[PDB]
Symmetry: C3
Subunit: 107 residues, 3 copies
């Protein structure tokens, strides 16, 4: 999947998490988000199409995707413990961090 596909998967699974009723649906959605965040870190967003992958700018992009994976993993740990509303709050919060990355690198 290209970068925009991975971002769509993040968007689609955030919507699943906010409507979820039990931990298993929240964890499954977070695992799909984690896979997408890892994939996004290996892809090239539009704003970086012609940049050297070892540039400071490309590294900052990949680190930003790694930050998303950290937050997704923390929300997975909350949900694993049965703290489903807490994991849902964490997902709502990391929606804004995902959005920051999306807006920075899209188009």
């Amino acid at each position: 999947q290209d970068w925009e596909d991975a971002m769509e998967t993040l968007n689609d699974n955030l919507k699943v998490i906010e409507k979820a009723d039990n931990a298993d649906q929240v964890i499954a959605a977070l695992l799909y988000m984690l896979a997408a965040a890892i994939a996004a870190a290996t892809a090239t967003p539009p704003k970086l199409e012609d940049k050297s992958p070892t540039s400071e700018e490309a590294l900052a992009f990949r680190l930003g995707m790694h930050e998303l994976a950290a937050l997704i993993t923390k929300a997975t740990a909350l949900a694993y413990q049965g703290l489903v509303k807490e994991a849902q709050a964490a997902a709502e919060q990391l929606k804004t961090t995902v959005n920051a990355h999306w807006q920075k690198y899209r188009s």
Copy 2:
């Protein structure tokens, strides 16, 4: 030897997944693969022994191992849902990707000058 060892762990656990009878057996094998994929991205394969770790070619290698981690994680999501046949099919697909990475970065010395 670290990269070759990780690749062996990937191949070993793909066989576990093919023989698995339930979701928990598949998930455990995928978690071992994910650990080996992450470890492999910190290793230097034979093809890159002489290159700067900050070179483009070394980064491309690391991102290729991260691609494998993403496929493994997706298979793990399928197995967590109970979609065992689907996770097994995803694993058969990532075997092809593991093979491609292995052929790209392994030592080619047996093939020199053929």
Copy 3:
């Protein structure tokens, strides 16, 4: 968020694992450790404040954190199979790794 805050989360959750009685307690703590290791790889520790983020020294730091995430994930696989004592022994090994990394990268 601090590199130091991620190191504290790793330290805290190693104590949780050492006192655990069952696999789910170990798995939850390992997942918090995995989140912290990933987060730490995106931070700049004091030792690296004077270096380019694209330097070999910064890359070695990030790969040391990735190495820690691999060990954490392997301990999670052990605990997922019910091998609680094995997972706790793996955690004792990564205590050493976390300590070494802390000592290396703290202080400018």
